[PDB]
Amino acid sequence: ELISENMHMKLYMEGTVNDHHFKCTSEGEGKPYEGTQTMKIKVVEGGPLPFAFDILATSFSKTFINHTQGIPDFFKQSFPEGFTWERITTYEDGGVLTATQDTSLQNGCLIYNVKINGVNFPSNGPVMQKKTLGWEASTEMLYPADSGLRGHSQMALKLVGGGYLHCSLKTTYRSKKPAKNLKMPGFYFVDRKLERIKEADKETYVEQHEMAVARYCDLPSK
Amino acid sequence: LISENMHMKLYMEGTVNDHHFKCTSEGEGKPYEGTQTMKIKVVEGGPLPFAFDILATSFSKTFINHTQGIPDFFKQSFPEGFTWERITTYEDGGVLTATQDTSLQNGCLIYNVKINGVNFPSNGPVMQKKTLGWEASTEMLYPADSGLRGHSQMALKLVGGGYLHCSLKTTYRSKKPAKNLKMPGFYFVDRKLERIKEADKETYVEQHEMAVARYCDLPSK
Amino acid sequence: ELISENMHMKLYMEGTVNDHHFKCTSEGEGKPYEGTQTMKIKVVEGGPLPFAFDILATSFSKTFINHTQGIPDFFKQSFPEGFTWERITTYEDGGVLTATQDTSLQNGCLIYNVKINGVNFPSNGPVMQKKTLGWEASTEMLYPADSGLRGHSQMALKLVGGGYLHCSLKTTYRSKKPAKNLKMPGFYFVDRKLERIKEADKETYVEQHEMAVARYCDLPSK
Amino acid sequence: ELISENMHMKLYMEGTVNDHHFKCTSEGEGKPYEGTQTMKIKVVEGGPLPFAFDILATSFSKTFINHTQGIPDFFKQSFPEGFTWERITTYEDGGVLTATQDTSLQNGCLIYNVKINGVNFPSNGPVMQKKTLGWEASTEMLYPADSGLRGHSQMALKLVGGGYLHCSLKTTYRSKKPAKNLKMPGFYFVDRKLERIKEADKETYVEQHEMAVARYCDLPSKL
């Protein structure tokens, strides 16, 4: 395939959260079939960001899911054409972050381009006041809808002092390959753990590692 | 206390949109293995004009297998018991809200449920009965609001192959004083709720649930 | 017709908010065609309530709307048979209150039967802390949907210390009269001011007054 | 003062709805104190759009609100520096449109820069099917929150064949003036009517007019 066992990525991100404009770039590498990857990210315009970098974590990679149990892999199948995703993340204290993303393969490097637009993050809440400590593990459910894949997830943001801020994600993933050339999956889950591995200079340099494994529910039917 | 085999007794009243109804049920399960079966009868208001699936999560938190040493909020709560309060919101505007009392009286678990559903659309899948039961789901739980907050989503199978989506937001509240309980931190519950029998236009239903509490499996760092 | 210019009502309410059960009853009088009405409310079981009584205010009367400009009156038309309503109110701090109601006409008296179910009101928010100070005015939009009338509104709840807690209402009103026997309205608006006029005994006795007037938007068109 | 009885505007817009990229520009003029205005709009990249232009209507001007009854005018007071706004629009059938906007005054011309990001518009919904017929009238409620103004509104989109698609708007309006150089409004309403006046070329050319008037509830209080 066009997708080898070891892969590199380059990403460009532009966005506004509330009234704050910024731009980021990243480089990473990963193991697409093993479902692991690492991104090294730079905030290159608008830094330091007045908000916790955590709210941008999920906008930095769907090729790198280990699909088990024979679940067809919508993302890997989509090459050489590529795919797009579009998401809304809604925080329980009224912040909203939308993202739309293009994924292309050029010269055997994955290229990501992301546009972020966040609005209504409370100015005295944990995100604008940087009281956050990263994400717990999460499970997304995916299934065919709207001519691609729909994904639904919920995630919990660790807060200083031991509490949690909740959010939900609703995504639609769309293949640039025609649908007659795809073996579509049915309903399944992706478990993931996205972890900050280091940061420097007021979150203007960040490293992230994710592991992502696709699976069915392993419980028996009666 | 709660044994390896327990029985349960349930009464439920509610209104969906404008339709009033009552159900009862009786069950038998294994709390530490986290399996259970409920045998349900619609006793007033049957046949319901909406799919019975929307009532499924309202018929049992004692019956979760809490593995990996996770403190068990529900089993710990007895003899005093606990409550839960939930909103289920469907993507097409239906909303089902539920509040529940769990007691224990002479070795029997006793469940009392009130239901209030609104805004279920007239020509949507629930009211037109085009649903085919729920896929498996995962709830995340963590302390909040003086008990445990649970967050789940679920996908209702539709005739023809599609899905209707719904989010659940629950608060579970122990009747046993905070000082007498060991709280868990963040964890998941995986479950599979299946209809195993029906009859008489969904006025008699049997459901089986399996539920297991765990942490994420994935290597860290 | 059966709706006179001066009318009485009696109400019975039952419900639970989080884990707290309660019952209320009330009696009222008002002027249906003028859109004004007063309800005198008693909390008869579960008093005193742990939550602000404000969250129950909108669950205590759609016959008393002044329908102006010839807008057909879905509610006064539905008698003698009556109507039902069902609503969800969603608070921006995670509280949710749903209510289902039956409105009948018996010996010249309007009879209301309300069931309340409120869930997830945060223990540190204004409702549970009893730090609220009543509602601002609001405007509902209504239009035919779902074989009845759909209503959408938003309300602002005044808070001790200043500022507001926002909620949104989504309702469906349903006539017990056949469609063929109703003149349906098109799209319109109802302006209201609901005000607490009296309270005693830790909110176990309350008096509310509402003025409601239906209209179209009066702005010139192009 | 810097805001006249007649003002002109220029706008630049960049965005993506679902996976479709586009840019728009427009110019208009209007009467800030009578709260009327007209915008003529060109799609200059990505046209003809595969979605209903109606979803972009509210992202093309808060200076043109007639603030009656003495209500302090957060927007007109903010000049020469200007203000920003950020909004989420949520459609009952799953589509979401967020927008962030900068409003500036340069050369006695009002300048708007907008970025749109919409996601998850259903393929068989009226918006993706271009089966919409413009907006009914609407009311916004506004009050101080978060060091700016919070706005909540709801709108009904007319549909081919009858009936409506609902959406809610939640906005935060932020002044570039510091708070101690502003007289802040309390709670109030804005009534508006945004109307499509002309269109050409499969909606690649559109004229909208809006009238907006600030007011309190004029029902009598019993308190």
PDB file of all heavy atoms in Angstrom, chain A residues 18 84 86 94 98-100 115 117 120 122-123 146 170-172 174, chain D residues 18-19 86 88 94 98-100 115 117 119-120 122-123 146 170 172 174:
ATOM      1  N   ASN A  18     -12.228  32.528  20.365  1.00  0.00           N
ATOM      2  CA  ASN A  18     -12.848  33.724  20.857  1.00  0.00           C
ATOM      3  C   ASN A  18     -12.358  34.820  19.886  1.00  0.00           C
ATOM      4  O   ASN A  18     -12.702  34.801  18.704  1.00  0.00           O
ATOM      5  CB  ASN A  18     -12.487  33.956  22.326  1.00  0.00           C
ATOM      6  CG  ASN A  18     -13.251  33.012  23.253  1.00  0.00           C
ATOM      7  OD1 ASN A  18     -13.818  32.058  22.763  1.00  0.00           O
ATOM      8  ND2 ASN A  18     -13.234  33.258  24.558  1.00  0.00           N
ATOM      9  N   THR A  84     -11.209  14.097   4.514  1.00  0.00           N
ATOM     10  CA  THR A  84     -11.371  15.290   5.273  1.00  0.00           C
ATOM     11  C   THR A  84     -12.140  14.907   6.511  1.00  0.00           C
ATOM     12  O   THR A  84     -12.733  13.864   6.522  1.00  0.00           O
ATOM     13  CB  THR A  84     -12.204  16.422   4.531  1.00  0.00           C
ATOM     14  OG1 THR A  84     -13.504  16.007   4.173  1.00  0.00           O
ATOM     15  CG2 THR A  84     -11.554  16.796   3.191  1.00  0.00           C
ATOM     16  N   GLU A  86     -14.542  16.970   9.900  1.00  0.00           N
ATOM     17  CA  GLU A  86     -15.069  18.220  10.290  1.00  0.00           C
ATOM     18  C   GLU A  86     -15.698  17.885  11.625  1.00  0.00           C
ATOM     19  O   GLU A  86     -16.312  16.881  11.712  1.00  0.00           O
ATOM     20  CB  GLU A  86     -16.159  18.688   9.324  1.00  0.00           C
ATOM     21  CG  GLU A  86     -17.262  17.634   9.022  1.00  0.00           C
ATOM     22  CD  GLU A  86     -18.080  17.856   7.726  1.00  0.00           C
ATOM     23  OE1 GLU A  86     -17.473  17.798   6.595  1.00  0.00           O
ATOM     24  OE2 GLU A  86     -19.339  17.961   7.861  1.00  0.00           O
ATOM     25  N   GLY A  94     -19.702  26.030  27.980  1.00  0.00           N
ATOM     26  CA  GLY A  94     -20.297  26.838  26.956  1.00  0.00           C
ATOM     27  C   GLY A  94     -19.249  27.130  25.911  1.00  0.00           C
ATOM     28  O   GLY A  94     -19.554  27.711  24.850  1.00  0.00           O
ATOM     29  N   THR A  98     -14.830  24.399  16.773  1.00  0.00           N
ATOM     30  CA  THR A  98     -15.039  23.673  15.554  1.00  0.00           C
ATOM     31  C   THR A  98     -13.699  23.624  14.762  1.00  0.00           C
ATOM     32  O   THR A  98     -12.832  24.497  14.941  1.00  0.00           O
ATOM     33  CB  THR A  98     -16.170  24.258  14.636  1.00  0.00           C
ATOM     34  OG1 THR A  98     -15.769  25.507  14.093  1.00  0.00           O
ATOM     35  CG2 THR A  98     -17.563  24.374  15.394  1.00  0.00           C
ATOM     36  N   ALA A  99     -13.551  22.544  14.014  1.00  0.00           N
ATOM     37  CA  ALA A  99     -12.317  22.299  13.227  1.00  0.00           C
ATOM     38  C   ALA A  99     -12.667  21.634  11.915  1.00  0.00           C
ATOM     39  O   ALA A  99     -13.425  20.745  11.849  1.00  0.00           O
ATOM     40  CB  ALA A  99     -11.366  21.425  14.050  1.00  0.00           C
ATOM     41  N   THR A 100     -11.980  21.984  10.819  1.00  0.00           N
ATOM     42  CA  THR A 100     -12.208  21.276   9.589  1.00  0.00           C
ATOM     43  C   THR A 100     -10.794  21.028   9.071  1.00  0.00           C
ATOM     44  O   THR A 100      -9.925  21.865   9.296  1.00  0.00           O
ATOM     45  CB  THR A 100     -12.945  22.133   8.505  1.00  0.00           C
ATOM     46  OG1 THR A 100     -12.334  23.440   8.437  1.00  0.00           O
ATOM     47  CG2 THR A 100     -14.475  22.256   8.860  1.00  0.00           C
ATOM     48  N   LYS A 115      -8.183  24.211  10.117  1.00  0.00           N
ATOM     49  CA  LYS A 115      -8.777  25.521  10.379  1.00  0.00           C
ATOM     50  C   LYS A 115      -9.634  25.351  11.608  1.00  0.00           C
ATOM     51  O   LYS A 115     -10.499  24.515  11.607  1.00  0.00           O
ATOM     52  CB  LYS A 115      -9.685  25.901   9.247  1.00  0.00           C
ATOM     53  CG  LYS A 115      -8.918  26.129   7.933  1.00  0.00           C
ATOM     54  CD  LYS A 115      -7.671  26.938   8.234  1.00  0.00           C
ATOM     55  CE  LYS A 115      -7.064  27.570   6.942  1.00  0.00           C
ATOM     56  NZ  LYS A 115      -7.102  26.590   5.804  1.00  0.00           N
ATOM     57  N   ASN A 117     -12.007  27.213  14.752  1.00  0.00           N
ATOM     58  CA  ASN A 117     -12.746  28.399  15.093  1.00  0.00           C
ATOM     59  C   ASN A 117     -13.463  28.030  16.375  1.00  0.00           C
ATOM     60  O   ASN A 117     -14.331  27.166  16.258  1.00  0.00           O
ATOM     61  CB  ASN A 117     -13.807  28.573  14.049  1.00  0.00           C
ATOM     62  CG  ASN A 117     -14.313  30.030  13.908  1.00  0.00           C
ATOM     63  OD1 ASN A 117     -13.564  30.964  13.618  1.00  0.00           O
ATOM     64  ND2 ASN A 117     -15.639  30.201  14.126  1.00  0.00           N
ATOM     65  N   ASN A 120     -17.025  31.611  22.484  1.00  0.00           N
ATOM     66  CA  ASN A 120     -17.774  31.528  23.738  1.00  0.00           C
ATOM     67  C   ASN A 120     -17.093  30.826  24.916  1.00  0.00           C
ATOM     68  O   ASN A 120     -17.756  30.475  25.891  1.00  0.00           O
ATOM     69  CB  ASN A 120     -19.148  30.895  23.489  1.00  0.00           C
ATOM     70  CG  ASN A 120     -20.001  31.710  22.537  1.00  0.00           C
ATOM     71  OD1 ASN A 120     -20.766  31.158  21.745  1.00  0.00           O
ATOM     72  ND2 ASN A 120     -19.873  33.029  22.609  1.00  0.00           N
ATOM     73  N   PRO A 122     -15.584  30.660  28.300  1.00  0.00           N
ATOM     74  CA  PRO A 122     -15.778  31.663  29.323  1.00  0.00           C
ATOM     75  C   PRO A 122     -14.454  32.256  29.736  1.00  0.00           C
ATOM     76  O   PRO A 122     -13.485  31.570  29.801  1.00  0.00           O
ATOM     77  CB  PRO A 122     -16.414  30.899  30.474  1.00  0.00           C
ATOM     78  CG  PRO A 122     -16.811  29.665  29.976  1.00  0.00           C
ATOM     79  CD  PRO A 122     -16.102  29.365  28.717  1.00  0.00           C
ATOM     80  N   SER A 123     -14.424  33.544  29.989  1.00  0.00           N
ATOM     81  CA  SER A 123     -13.163  34.187  30.229  1.00  0.00           C
ATOM     82  C   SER A 123     -12.639  33.898  31.598  1.00  0.00           C
ATOM     83  O   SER A 123     -11.509  34.073  31.836  1.00  0.00           O
ATOM     84  CB  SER A 123     -13.229  35.687  29.982  1.00  0.00           C
ATOM     85  OG  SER A 123     -14.311  36.045  29.188  1.00  0.00           O
ATOM     86  N   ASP A 146     -24.281  10.189   6.094  1.00  0.00           N
ATOM     87  CA  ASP A 146     -24.004  11.405   5.297  1.00  0.00           C
ATOM     88  C   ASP A 146     -22.921  11.193   4.255  1.00  0.00           C
ATOM     89  O   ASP A 146     -22.133  12.103   3.966  1.00  0.00           O
ATOM     90  CB  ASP A 146     -23.692  12.632   6.191  1.00  0.00           C
ATOM     91  CG  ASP A 146     -24.962  13.204   6.909  1.00  0.00           C
ATOM     92  OD1 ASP A 146     -25.996  13.384   6.246  1.00  0.00           O
ATOM     93  OD2 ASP A 146     -24.944  13.479   8.124  1.00  0.00           O
ATOM     94  N   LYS A 170     -18.616  15.573  17.840  1.00  0.00           N
ATOM     95  CA  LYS A 170     -19.364  15.004  16.745  1.00  0.00           C
ATOM     96  C   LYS A 170     -18.578  15.283  15.438  1.00  0.00           C
ATOM     97  O   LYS A 170     -18.370  16.457  15.159  1.00  0.00           O
ATOM     98  CB  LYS A 170     -20.637  15.754  16.606  1.00  0.00           C
ATOM     99  CG  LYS A 170     -21.622  14.998  15.694  1.00  0.00           C
ATOM    100  CD  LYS A 170     -22.896  15.762  15.510  1.00  0.00           C
ATOM    101  CE  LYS A 170     -23.625  15.296  14.254  1.00  0.00           C
ATOM    102  NZ  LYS A 170     -24.706  16.288  14.006  1.00  0.00           N
ATOM    103  N   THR A 171     -18.282  14.237  14.690  1.00  0.00           N
ATOM    104  CA  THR A 171     -17.304  14.406  13.539  1.00  0.00           C
ATOM    105  C   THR A 171     -17.982  13.796  12.333  1.00  0.00           C
ATOM    106  O   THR A 171     -18.757  12.830  12.465  1.00  0.00           O
ATOM    107  CB  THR A 171     -16.023  13.604  13.839  1.00  0.00           C
ATOM    108  OG1 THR A 171     -15.580  13.949  15.141  1.00  0.00           O
ATOM    109  CG2 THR A 171     -14.809  14.185  12.912  1.00  0.00           C
ATOM    110  N   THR A 172     -17.619  14.236  11.083  1.00  0.00           N
ATOM    111  CA  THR A 172     -18.000  13.515   9.953  1.00  0.00           C
ATOM    112  C   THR A 172     -16.694  13.407   9.173  1.00  0.00           C
ATOM    113  O   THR A 172     -16.030  14.393   9.131  1.00  0.00           O
ATOM    114  CB  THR A 172     -19.105  14.258   9.088  1.00  0.00           C
ATOM    115  OG1 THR A 172     -20.335  14.362   9.909  1.00  0.00           O
ATOM    116  CG2 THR A 172     -19.460  13.358   7.901  1.00  0.00           C
ATOM    117  N   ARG A 174     -14.861  12.194   5.592  1.00  0.00           N
ATOM    118  CA  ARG A 174     -15.362  12.016   4.256  1.00  0.00           C
ATOM    119  C   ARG A 174     -14.152  11.666   3.391  1.00  0.00           C
ATOM    120  O   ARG A 174     -13.132  12.385   3.436  1.00  0.00           O
ATOM    121  CB  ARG A 174     -15.971  13.315   3.718  1.00  0.00           C
ATOM    122  CG  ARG A 174     -17.101  13.920   4.553  1.00  0.00           C
ATOM    123  CD  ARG A 174     -17.759  15.158   3.881  1.00  0.00           C
ATOM    124  NE  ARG A 174     -18.593  15.871   4.830  1.00  0.00           N
ATOM    125  CZ  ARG A 174     -19.856  15.530   5.048  1.00  0.00           C
ATOM    126  NH1 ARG A 174     -20.405  14.549   4.321  1.00  0.00           N
ATOM    127  NH2 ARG A 174     -20.572  16.160   5.979  1.00  0.00           N
TER     128      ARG A 174
ATOM    129  N   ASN D  18     -18.654  22.183   5.971  1.00  0.00           N
ATOM    130  CA  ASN D  18     -18.379  20.778   5.768  1.00  0.00           C
ATOM    131  C   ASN D  18     -16.938  20.709   5.198  1.00  0.00           C
ATOM    132  O   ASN D  18     -15.978  21.054   5.884  1.00  0.00           O
ATOM    133  CB  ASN D  18     -19.459  20.072   4.900  1.00  0.00           C
ATOM    134  CG  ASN D  18     -20.803  19.885   5.692  1.00  0.00           C
ATOM    135  OD1 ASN D  18     -20.943  20.469   6.778  1.00  0.00           O
ATOM    136  ND2 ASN D  18     -21.758  19.124   5.141  1.00  0.00           N
ATOM    137  N   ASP D  19     -16.841  20.304   3.941  1.00  0.00           N
ATOM    138  CA  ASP D  19     -15.544  20.256   3.285  1.00  0.00           C
ATOM    139  C   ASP D  19     -15.408  21.272   2.162  1.00  0.00           C
ATOM    140  O   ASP D  19     -14.429  21.245   1.407  1.00  0.00           O
ATOM    141  CB  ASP D  19     -15.327  18.823   2.778  1.00  0.00           C
ATOM    142  CG  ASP D  19     -16.416  18.368   1.825  1.00  0.00           C
ATOM    143  OD1 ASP D  19     -17.339  19.154   1.482  1.00  0.00           O
ATOM    144  OD2 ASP D  19     -16.389  17.236   1.395  1.00  0.00           O
ATOM    145  N   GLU D  86     -18.210  36.727  18.122  1.00  0.00           N
ATOM    146  CA  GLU D  86     -17.961  35.321  17.839  1.00  0.00           C
ATOM    147  C   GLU D  86     -19.270  34.622  18.139  1.00  0.00           C
ATOM    148  O   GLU D  86     -19.875  34.979  19.100  1.00  0.00           O
ATOM    149  CB  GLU D  86     -16.895  34.813  18.772  1.00  0.00           C
ATOM    150  CG  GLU D  86     -17.267  34.820  20.278  1.00  0.00           C
ATOM    151  CD  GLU D  86     -16.111  35.010  21.245  1.00  0.00           C
ATOM    152  OE1 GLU D  86     -15.321  35.989  21.124  1.00  0.00           O
ATOM    153  OE2 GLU D  86     -15.951  34.195  22.172  1.00  0.00           O
ATOM    154  N   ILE D  88     -21.931  30.845  17.732  1.00  0.00           N
ATOM    155  CA  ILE D  88     -22.243  29.541  17.201  1.00  0.00           C
ATOM    156  C   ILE D  88     -23.731  29.512  16.767  1.00  0.00           C
ATOM    157  O   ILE D  88     -24.633  29.835  17.559  1.00  0.00           O
ATOM    158  CB  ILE D  88     -21.937  28.354  18.206  1.00  0.00           C
ATOM    159  CG1 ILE D  88     -22.422  27.022  17.586  1.00  0.00           C
ATOM    160  CG2 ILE D  88     -22.448  28.702  19.678  1.00  0.00           C
ATOM    161  CD1 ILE D  88     -22.333  25.685  18.461  1.00  0.00           C
ATOM    162  N   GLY D  94     -28.544  19.081  12.673  1.00  0.00           N
ATOM    163  CA  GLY D  94     -27.186  18.627  13.051  1.00  0.00           C
ATOM    164  C   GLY D  94     -26.097  19.554  12.476  1.00  0.00           C
ATOM    165  O   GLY D  94     -24.952  19.490  12.909  1.00  0.00           O
ATOM    166  N   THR D  98     -20.048  28.253  12.983  1.00  0.00           N
ATOM    167  CA  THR D  98     -19.462  29.171  13.906  1.00  0.00           C
ATOM    168  C   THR D  98     -18.854  30.275  13.050  1.00  0.00           C
ATOM    169  O   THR D  98     -18.533  30.006  11.913  1.00  0.00           O
ATOM    170  CB  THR D  98     -18.360  28.557  14.782  1.00  0.00           C
ATOM    171  OG1 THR D  98     -17.261  28.080  13.965  1.00  0.00           O
ATOM    172  CG2 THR D  98     -18.887  27.363  15.580  1.00  0.00           C
ATOM    173  N   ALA D  99     -18.760  31.478  13.603  1.00  0.00           N
ATOM    174  CA  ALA D  99     -18.137  32.607  12.907  1.00  0.00           C
ATOM    175  C   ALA D  99     -17.449  33.531  13.920  1.00  0.00           C
ATOM    176  O   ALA D  99     -17.871  33.700  15.072  1.00  0.00           O
ATOM    177  CB  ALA D  99     -19.168  33.352  12.139  1.00  0.00           C
ATOM    178  N   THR D 100     -16.321  34.131  13.496  1.00  0.00           N
ATOM    179  CA  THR D 100     -15.623  35.069  14.342  1.00  0.00           C
ATOM    180  C   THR D 100     -15.433  36.250  13.399  1.00  0.00           C
ATOM    181  O   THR D 100     -15.304  36.057  12.163  1.00  0.00           O
ATOM    182  CB  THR D 100     -14.248  34.479  14.893  1.00  0.00           C
ATOM    183  OG1 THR D 100     -13.527  33.862  13.804  1.00  0.00           O
ATOM    184  CG2 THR D 100     -14.541  33.382  15.970  1.00  0.00           C
ATOM    185  N   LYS D 115     -14.479  34.944   9.604  1.00  0.00           N
ATOM    186  CA  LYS D 115     -14.110  33.571   9.287  1.00  0.00           C
ATOM    187  C   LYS D 115     -15.256  32.694   9.736  1.00  0.00           C
ATOM    188  O   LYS D 115     -15.737  32.860  10.851  1.00  0.00           O
ATOM    189  CB  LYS D 115     -12.840  33.168  10.008  1.00  0.00           C
ATOM    190  CG  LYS D 115     -11.672  34.071   9.645  1.00  0.00           C
ATOM    191  CD  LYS D 115     -10.580  34.092  10.718  1.00  0.00           C
ATOM    192  CE  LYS D 115      -9.686  35.356  10.530  1.00  0.00           C
ATOM    193  NZ  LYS D 115      -8.258  34.981  10.393  1.00  0.00           N
ATOM    194  N   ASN D 117     -16.779  28.582   9.934  1.00  0.00           N
ATOM    195  CA  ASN D 117     -16.387  27.209   9.889  1.00  0.00           C
ATOM    196  C   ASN D 117     -17.710  26.499  10.202  1.00  0.00           C
ATOM    197  O   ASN D 117     -18.208  26.678  11.284  1.00  0.00           O
ATOM    198  CB  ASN D 117     -15.310  27.034  10.975  1.00  0.00           C
ATOM    199  CG  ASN D 117     -14.369  25.856  10.776  1.00  0.00           C
ATOM    200  OD1 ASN D 117     -14.005  25.240  11.765  1.00  0.00           O
ATOM    201  ND2 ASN D 117     -13.861  25.614   9.556  1.00  0.00           N
ATOM    202  N   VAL D 119     -20.000  22.733  10.158  1.00  0.00           N
ATOM    203  CA  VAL D 119     -19.663  21.346  10.139  1.00  0.00           C
ATOM    204  C   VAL D 119     -20.948  20.552  10.264  1.00  0.00           C
ATOM    205  O   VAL D 119     -21.924  21.084  10.837  1.00  0.00           O
ATOM    206  CB  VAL D 119     -18.643  20.977  11.306  1.00  0.00           C
ATOM    207  CG1 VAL D 119     -17.314  21.767  11.252  1.00  0.00           C
ATOM    208  CG2 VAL D 119     -19.246  21.241  12.676  1.00  0.00           C
ATOM    209  N   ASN D 120     -20.891  19.328   9.745  1.00  0.00           N
ATOM    210  CA  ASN D 120     -21.903  18.290   9.876  1.00  0.00           C
ATOM    211  C   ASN D 120     -23.302  18.588   9.314  1.00  0.00           C
ATOM    212  O   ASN D 120     -24.311  17.989   9.804  1.00  0.00           O
ATOM    213  CB  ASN D 120     -22.116  17.962  11.362  1.00  0.00           C
ATOM    214  CG  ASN D 120     -20.882  17.431  12.075  1.00  0.00           C
ATOM    215  OD1 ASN D 120     -20.592  17.873  13.203  1.00  0.00           O
ATOM    216  ND2 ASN D 120     -20.189  16.488  11.522  1.00  0.00           N
ATOM    217  N   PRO D 122     -26.338  17.955   7.324  1.00  0.00           N
ATOM    218  CA  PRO D 122     -26.755  16.680   6.769  1.00  0.00           C
ATOM    219  C   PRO D 122     -26.957  16.720   5.227  1.00  0.00           C
ATOM    220  O   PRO D 122     -27.484  17.690   4.717  1.00  0.00           O
ATOM    221  CB  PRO D 122     -28.042  16.353   7.566  1.00  0.00           C
ATOM    222  CG  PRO D 122     -28.523  17.636   7.990  1.00  0.00           C
ATOM    223  CD  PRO D 122     -27.316  18.469   8.295  1.00  0.00           C
ATOM    224  N   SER D 123     -26.527  15.681   4.490  1.00  0.00           N
ATOM    225  CA  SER D 123     -26.610  15.749   2.994  1.00  0.00           C
ATOM    226  C   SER D 123     -28.032  15.810   2.487  1.00  0.00           C
ATOM    227  O   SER D 123     -28.301  16.420   1.473  1.00  0.00           O
ATOM    228  CB  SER D 123     -25.852  14.593   2.327  1.00  0.00           C
ATOM    229  OG  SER D 123     -25.947  13.429   3.108  1.00  0.00           O
ATOM    230  N   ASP D 146     -19.134  37.852  30.721  1.00  0.00           N
ATOM    231  CA  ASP D 146     -17.778  37.603  30.182  1.00  0.00           C
ATOM    232  C   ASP D 146     -17.007  38.801  29.701  1.00  0.00           C
ATOM    233  O   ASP D 146     -16.339  38.688  28.673  1.00  0.00           O
ATOM    234  CB  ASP D 146     -17.865  36.677  28.960  1.00  0.00           C
ATOM    235  CG  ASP D 146     -17.617  35.238  29.316  1.00  0.00           C
ATOM    236  OD1 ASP D 146     -16.451  34.963  29.640  1.00  0.00           O
ATOM    237  OD2 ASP D 146     -18.570  34.403  29.292  1.00  0.00           O
ATOM    238  N   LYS D 170     -25.795  31.749  19.698  1.00  0.00           N
ATOM    239  CA  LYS D 170     -25.239  32.189  20.950  1.00  0.00           C
ATOM    240  C   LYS D 170     -24.002  33.015  20.576  1.00  0.00           C
ATOM    241  O   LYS D 170     -23.138  32.445  19.908  1.00  0.00           O
ATOM    242  CB  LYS D 170     -24.822  31.031  21.816  1.00  0.00           C
ATOM    243  CG  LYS D 170     -24.229  31.515  23.131  1.00  0.00           C
ATOM    244  CD  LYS D 170     -23.573  30.400  23.948  1.00  0.00           C
ATOM    245  CE  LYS D 170     -23.044  30.860  25.276  1.00  0.00           C
ATOM    246  NZ  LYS D 170     -22.347  29.584  25.737  1.00  0.00           N
ATOM    247  N   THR D 172     -20.894  36.258  21.629  1.00  0.00           N
ATOM    248  CA  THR D 172     -20.276  37.142  22.596  1.00  0.00           C
ATOM    249  C   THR D 172     -19.705  38.321  21.817  1.00  0.00           C
ATOM    250  O   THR D 172     -19.069  38.103  20.783  1.00  0.00           O
ATOM    251  CB  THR D 172     -19.182  36.472  23.414  1.00  0.00           C
ATOM    252  OG1 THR D 172     -19.765  35.388  24.177  1.00  0.00           O
ATOM    253  CG2 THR D 172     -18.652  37.454  24.463  1.00  0.00           C
ATOM    254  N   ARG D 174     -17.516  41.780  21.885  1.00  0.00           N
ATOM    255  CA  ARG D 174     -16.418  42.237  22.722  1.00  0.00           C
ATOM    256  C   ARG D 174     -15.922  43.578  22.175  1.00  0.00           C
ATOM    257  O   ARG D 174     -15.651  43.665  20.973  1.00  0.00           O
ATOM    258  CB  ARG D 174     -15.237  41.204  22.701  1.00  0.00           C
ATOM    259  CG  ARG D 174     -15.597  39.832  23.303  1.00  0.00           C
ATOM    260  CD  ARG D 174     -14.382  38.841  23.233  1.00  0.00           C
ATOM    261  NE  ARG D 174     -14.782  37.457  23.488  1.00  0.00           N
ATOM    262  CZ  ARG D 174     -15.219  37.023  24.657  1.00  0.00           C
ATOM    263  NH1 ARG D 174     -15.237  37.823  25.703  1.00  0.00           N
ATOM    264  NH2 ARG D 174     -15.575  35.768  24.785  1.00  0.00           N
TER     265      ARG D 174
END
